């Protein structure tokens, strides 16, 4: 199997390639909330992605698919 760390927690997947949205739903996050989806790869700067984009967990160096609240407006 192939594993992807979502928001700091590693989740195992039965497919070599998993859609962002699917991995996001596996972690308990809402894909249709407003998020800034980013993927990390060792030796590479973080790259912004789409909720429906598909990732390949076989990609070497894959670190974490982390989301950051798109709107941060609390006082």
């Amino acid at each position: 199997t192939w594993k992807l760390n979502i928001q700091g927690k590693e989740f195992t997947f039965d497919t070599p390639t998993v859609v962002i949205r699917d991995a996001v739903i596996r972690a308990g996050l809402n894909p249709n909330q407003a998020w800034h989806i980013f993927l990390k790869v060792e030796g590479q700067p973080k790259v912004e992605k789409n909720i429906d984009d598909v990732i390949d967990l076989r990609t070497p160096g894959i670190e974490k698919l982390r989301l950051t609240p798109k709107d941060v407006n609390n006082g």
Binding site: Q7, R26, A27, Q33, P69, V72, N73, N74
Partner: protein, 453 residues
């Protein structure tokens, strides 16, 4: 301090003017700046248009003197006639000039009288040196009058050119303190983040501090509001009134101006318009838009701060913090706005206004997105965000960073992800700013709800 006049120029105008005035030949050059004005507790000249006289059309361009045609003076007159705009002539460091015409040559004083004959308004004559520092004088009734107290340009770096001044102080010194003592600072929102920002402003030594909030102290917020007491919570003391008394006791002088009202009011807008710096620490998308429109209209640098602790239900563990995040946005007049940055959008303001049933219905329809769940606010994050907010102002007024301040136009930090990203002004797309230097033109801030009519 409070009633000091201001001459504000956008960075774009200043850079254009600076280049026109200092081409490199070592000789004089001339230009005219048409400005609107705001006249609240102080006078503010809001630069709007710029006219540059060609060197070729000038006659005696020498190192000390320049003679230029009156025709360019006559354009400014007509450009400033509809709104009786002010007209401020600019020249190179010496500043010696005459306005030659078809009939004869006019002296500096004669031309200021002519400008006032054309437009019934305050005018002025200003000088720039190679560095860009500007000194100016006002001519009321076309006659030598009061000198401009402060000529300011809030760009990536914030510039304050005082008339009393004749080296630049480094950050954190007495020179910084004295600069702040001569400035006004508006705090929009005095709860959680804003009480921390207001505290810093007061102890930094700001001469005048405005406070704009409609809420009041309560037991719930005794964990976040600085200077709040249980007694304040039992009396439901207005947050602005509480902090005003605090500042009073701290400074030993009543330098605060409490406004127990929302920023979405003529009172607040017109008070905030006198500030030299805006600190937006609200928690509504609508209030962010108002602050954004005030900053553009009255050419006031803006620092918007926000935090968020989103939460989600993990499949196995259960409720879990999704992230612990903060945001600091520096908005310079003429640069990218909070709107450009999507800090607020029309959809977000519309969803905020929806009533309970309204929200529910629309959410099901898929027309509006779903508000994220969050954890309770904590003073630790509020402090981390607010300290970076004021530090940003200090760093732009008194550069100490080893990178251009433009690099940090936007800051986003994550305490859960342990990350901190910076956005450059050059990576932000900008729309046409139709509010720039508009002032109090009605409808106020282009909002009919605030309109005087």
């Amino acid at each position: 301090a409070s009633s000091g006049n201001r001459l504000i120029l956008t960075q774009e105008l200043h850079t254009m003017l600076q280049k026109h005035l200092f081409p490199g030949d070592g000789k004089e050059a001339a230009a005219i700046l048409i400005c609107n004005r705001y006249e609240g507790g102080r006078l503010k000249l809001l630069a709007k248009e710029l006219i540059l006289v060609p060197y070729e059309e000038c006659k005696s361009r020498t190192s000390d003197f320049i003679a230029w045609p009156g025709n360019y003076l006559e354009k400014a007159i007509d450009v400033a006639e509809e709104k009786s705009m002010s007209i401020i002539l600019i020249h190179s460091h010496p500043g010696g000039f005459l306005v030659f015409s078809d009939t004869a040559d006019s002296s500096d004083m004669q031309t200021m009288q002519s400008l006032f004959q054309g437009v019934d308004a305050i005018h002025g004559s200003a000088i720039m040196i190679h560095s860009g520092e500007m000194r100016a004088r006002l001519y009321r009734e076309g006659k030598f009058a009061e000198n401009v107290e402060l000529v300011t340009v809030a760009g990536d770096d914030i510039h304050y050119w005082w008339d009393d001044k004749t080296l630049k102080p480094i950050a954190f010194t007495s020179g910084m303190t004295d600069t702040f003592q001569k400035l006004t600072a508006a705090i929009i929102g005095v709860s959680g983040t804003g009480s921390i920002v207001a505290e810093q402003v007061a102890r930094l030594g700001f001469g005048e501090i405005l406070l704009i909030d409609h809420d009041h102290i309560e037991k719930k917020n005794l964990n976040r509001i600085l200077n709040s007491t249980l007694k304040d919570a039992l009396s439901h003391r207005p947050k602005v009134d509480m902090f005003a008394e605090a500042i009073r006791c701290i400074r030993g002088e009543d330098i605060s101006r409490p406004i127990n009202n929302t920023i979405f009011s003529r009172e607040a807008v017109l008070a905030a318009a006198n500030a030299d710096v805006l600190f937006c620490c609200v928690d509504t998308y609508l209030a962010r838009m108002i602050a954004d429109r005030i900053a553009s209209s009255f050419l006031i640098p803006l620092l918007d701060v926000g935090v968020k602790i989103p939460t989600h239900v993990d499949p196995d563990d259960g409720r879990k913090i999704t992230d612990v995040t903060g945001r600091i946005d520096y908005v310079k007049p003429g640069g990218s706005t909070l709107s450009d940055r999507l800090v607020y959008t029309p959809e977000l303001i519309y969803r905020e206004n929806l009533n309970a049933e309204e929200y529910e219905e629309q959410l099901e329809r898929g027309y509006i997105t779903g508000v994220e769940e969050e954890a309770p606010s904590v003073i630790t994050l509020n402090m981390r965000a607010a300290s970076a907010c004021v530090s940003e102002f200090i760093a732009r007024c008194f550069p100490f960073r080893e990178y251009p301040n433009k690099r940090f136009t936007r800051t986003f930090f994550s305490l859960a992800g342990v990350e901190e990203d910076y956005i450059d002004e050059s990576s932000i797309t900008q729309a046409l700013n139709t509010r720039l230097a508009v002032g109090g033109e009605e409808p106020l801030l282009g909002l009919p709800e605030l309109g005087d009519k």
